[PDB]
Design a binder for this molecule. Structure first.
Ligand SMILES: Nc1nc2c(ncn2[C@@H]2O[C@H](COP(=O)(O)OP(=O)(O)O)[C@@H](O)[C@H]2O)c(=O)[nH]1
Length: 174
């Protein structure tokens, strides 16, 4: 009996969805850690920087943003058709926020990606002084993003905090 409403409950629901997503953000933001949590440490991975993660009916295109200039266009074009963009931010690394913001805004400035919902995740909320979702909406200038649905949650992969509401949001955007 999988406690209804538990994290395992949402994980099960999530993986059965036929869904493509991109998971992208600066290196060290917690993207690999996040996949490991939501996939319960079991998933398929194929290199394609870019990783194609598969589990259930779900495919995740995982990549670190701000990589080689020659591959940037290729990675952003590889995101065409996804149901959602999940943008991971290290909410406790104040000095990387400006780079994180600028890469997000440059990404959402790409044509093939028009209208795709974005979920910004302020990861590492467990660390003292980490930005909360209100502060991140502010520091990331999320209000400037007007041609799409954008949402922002404060989460902890380490303490498995708000991972459930993240899965629910993703399921809603199948
Ligand atoms: N304190 C804390 N550390 C985290 C959290 N999530 C990930 N990390 C750590 O951040 C470091 C980089 O994480 P990683 O998943 O490799 O980031 P990636 O480069 O975006 O894939 C690792 O040491 C993780 O354990 C979190 O929620 N809290």
């Amino acid at each position: 009996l999988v406690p209804r409403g538990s994290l395992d409950w949402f994980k099960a629901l999530f993986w059965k969805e036929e869904m493509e997503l991109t998971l992208v953000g600066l290196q060290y933001s917690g993207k690999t850690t996040f996949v490991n949590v939501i996939a319960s440490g079991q998933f398929n991975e194929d290199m394609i920087n870019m990783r194609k993660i598969t589990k259930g009916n779900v495919t995740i295109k995982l990549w670190d943003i701000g990589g080689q200039p020659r591959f940037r266009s290729m990675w952003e074009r590889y995101c065409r058709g996804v149901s959602a963009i999940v943008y991971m931010v290290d909410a406790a690394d104040q000095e990387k926020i400006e780079a994180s913001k600028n890469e997000l805004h440059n990404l959402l400035d790409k044509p093939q990606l028009q209208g795709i919902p974005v979920l910004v995740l302020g990861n590492k909320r467990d660390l003292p002084g980490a930005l909360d979702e209100k502060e991140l909406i502010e520091k990331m200038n999320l209000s400037a993003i007007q041609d799409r649905e954008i949402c922002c949650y404060s989460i902890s992969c380490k303490e498995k905090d708000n991972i459930d509401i993240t899965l629910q949001w993703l399921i809603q955007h199948s």
